[PDB]
Design a protein around this ligand. Structure first.
Ligand SMILES: CC(C)CCC[C@@H](C)[C@H]1CC[C@H]2[C@@H]3CC=C4C[C@@H](OC(=O)CCC(=O)O)CC[C@]4(C)[C@H]3CC[C@]12C
Ligand SMILES: CC(C)CCC[C@@H](C)[C@H]1CC[C@H]2[C@@H]3CC=C4C[C@@H](OC(=O)CCC(=O)O)CC[C@]4(C)[C@H]3CC[C@]12C
Ligand SMILES: CC(C)CCC[C@@H](C)[C@H]1CC[C@H]2[C@@H]3CC=C4C[C@@H](OC(=O)CCC(=O)O)CC[C@]4(C)[C@H]3CC[C@]12C
Ligand SMILES: CCC1(c2ccccc2)C(=O)NCNC1=O
Lengths: 72, 100
């Protein structure tokens, strides 16, 4: 379990992996935010919309992390 | 000598491999055309889509002439630049399209 677990950890921390896994989540986000604006919305948000609502504020916390955990 | 190595030499020429795809497509268009409609109607359509290919194969026949020939290979290289135009246009087109 130690050679295999070293493979999963070193893969999912490589920067090219961490790029394309943020990219297939941005291209997954963009498809969802397309569906909620093209299709109708009711008074309460849809299941598709709630995932979009997650993606914006969780990106907001990350954007504040880039400010706080910076060099100055 | 190896049959698969003979096939790999053949796939190298791009105009040759796009011949045999259109030949098999025209065969598929025939078999539907020889059936009762609507199968015939759709094999009419398959027949008209090979027309999109077989005028473009006149580009390769045109390549023999020393002036039109370099003009044809000029077109193929600029389409690699046109693909980058297509991707950037695709973002701007669907951004206006979804918003509208
Ligand atoms: C990794 C990247 C490249 C793609 C990841 C995104 C897709 C897997 C998502 C984004 C848009 C999603 C679709 C958006 C909306 C709908 C409608 C949805 O239907 C309803 O909500 C009403 C009917 C029902 O309840 O089934 C069914 C799922 C579906 C097709 C989703 C299926 C999954 C999709 C294609
Ligand atoms: C996290 C995002 C940015 C990327 C990953 C995409 C998928 C994990 C998401 C995108 C679209 C989602 C689907 C969008 C809509 C629906 C319909 C939903 O149907 C119902 O809830 C039916 C009952 C009801 O209407 O309440 C079930 C979940 C499902 C399939 C979702 C399952 C999870 C999906 C595939
Ligand atoms: C950014 C540029 C370089 C490329 C993006 C444009 C194409 C991907 C779009 C533009 C016009 C679109 C077409 C416009 C109309 C139709 C007819 C449509 O058929 C119907 O609606 C059925 C008949 C009817 O209901 O009237 C099927 C999609 C299609 C071929 C569309 C497919 C996608 C096309 C080719
Ligand atoms: C919102 C886009 C993105 C991103 C995604 C891929 C490449 C570059 C940036 C993200 O999804 N989260 C972190 N920062 C970002 O701006």
């Amino acid at each position: 379990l130690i050679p295999l677990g070293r493979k999963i950890y070193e893969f999912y921390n490589a920067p090219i992996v961490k790029f394309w896994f943020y990219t297939l989540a941005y291209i997954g986000y963009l498809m969802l935010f397309n569906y909620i604006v093209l299709v109708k919305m009711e008074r309460w948000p849809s299941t598709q919309e709630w995932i979009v609502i997650s993606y914006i504020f969780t990106l907001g916390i990350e954007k504040m992390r880039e400010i706080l955990m910076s060099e100055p | 000598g190896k049959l698969l190595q003979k096939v790999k030499v053949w796939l190298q020429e791009y105009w040759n491999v796009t011949d045999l795809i259109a030949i098999l497509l025209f065969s598929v268009g025939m078999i539907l055309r020889l059936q009762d409609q609507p199968f015939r109607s759709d094999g009419r359509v398959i027949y008209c889509v090979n027309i999109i290919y077989w005028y473009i194969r006149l580009l390769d026949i045109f390549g023999v002439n020393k002036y039109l020939g370099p003009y044809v290979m000029m077109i193929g290289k600029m389409m690699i630049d046109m693909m980058y135009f297509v991707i950037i246009m695709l973002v701007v087109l669907m951004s206006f399209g979804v918003a509208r």
